[PDB]
Design a protein around this ligand. Sequence first.
Ligand SMILES: O=C(O)[C@@H](COP(=O)(O)O)OP(=O)(O)O
Lengths: 229, 230
Amino acid sequence: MYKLVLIRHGESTWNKENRFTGWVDVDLTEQGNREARQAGQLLKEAGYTFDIAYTSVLKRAIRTLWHVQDQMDLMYVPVVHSWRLNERHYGALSGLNKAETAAKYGDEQVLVWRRSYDTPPPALEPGDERAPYADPRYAKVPREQLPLTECLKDTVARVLPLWNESIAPAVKAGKQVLIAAHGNSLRALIKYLDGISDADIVGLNIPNGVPLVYELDESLTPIRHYYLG
Amino acid sequence: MYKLVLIRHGESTWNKENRFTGWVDVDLTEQGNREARQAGQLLKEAGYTFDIAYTSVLKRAIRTLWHVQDQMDLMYVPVVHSWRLNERHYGALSGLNKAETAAKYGDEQVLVWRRSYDTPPPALEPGDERAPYADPRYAKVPREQLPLTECLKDTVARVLPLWNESIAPAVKAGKQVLIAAHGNSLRALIKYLDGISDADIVGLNIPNGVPLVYELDESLTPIRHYYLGD
Ligand SMILES: O=C(O)[C@@H](COP(=O)(O)O)OP(=O)(O)O
């Protein structure tokens, strides 16, 4: 029996502005901060603890983690910040208002761009300011592994090495893990963990700032899962 | 040539209350939060960046780091939190007001507790609430290595292994390192770095929340150091 807690970052600015975010490094709203703080308080009160946490390199997730740590009195635990946990990359949609985009390209198109397992949004041009190449966060990521766009499928491919190489061993080592990540990177990981089919994942949505608890057996096969609070 | 930036945590509740803190895990005051923020801005404006940061397991140091990372847009960097960077353990003095303590045991006595390199304050009882043993922060540290009190000499000895095993290799590795820690634990590191005598370390005081830049030669020998700011 292992427990693993997932939590999606609190409400970000672009969440609130209903803008596609992906790799753009936007921060938490005040509400996002509340949610993160409330999640940490929830975890504290339910008596949960952590020996390690995993996060992306995007401040909305890390700041959420911070608030969780702050509330749980766990600011001292090792935190692994991984670009592998990054939100799904939204290519040339990053920054665009979702309502405006669906008005322009149709809801269907947008729904494909948002939830197609295998078909990514349109890509960033390699020369877009928003491309990841010159970002210090990715300085050690081999260029050809940095996306200009992603579908969930890419996200799953990107997350898995972090799971296999780091999180799973941490869990089996008996470390109590928190993963603070993103809507679609958590969908990606959860797709893997729950062995969810390509069609079945399409409808999964994870609210901001709600601890999602996984109980895992000795082979790390999910037993059940549940949100806290 | 390398640069290493050191910063003592911003003002803490017990800094303001003039209380020996030690391993008591008190938080930053609002002033302390602002010092931490300002130090970040100052480093950001100076064009400083970091690849890795080292800190203690004490939130006053860690929150300072957070504010720095926040202001510098480096919330994603690896942070090693090590008990080895903890503030010097203050023993049975922890939580006591320094002024009343002086008023009771004498200025000399207090100053020997506070700045004598080799004489520790009086120890915590092993049964004291404040003893470290049940603390998850220290769960993997051998009991015998956990202090009930420390003089600076203990602090040095406690710090050096992190320096040798980890921070020095980072610096040699070409990593740009920030260490966010405490007055005495930095006094201890600096003693080693600058090769300050037992007598001389006595006067060294390190202000809250001010970046202290060391420029190190190839052999990690300080060439110069300066505070950033005023
Ligand atoms: O232990 C403490 O009270 C102070 C040092 O106090 P003095 O020994 O300098 O009085 O440490 P910090 O606030 O930097 O963590």
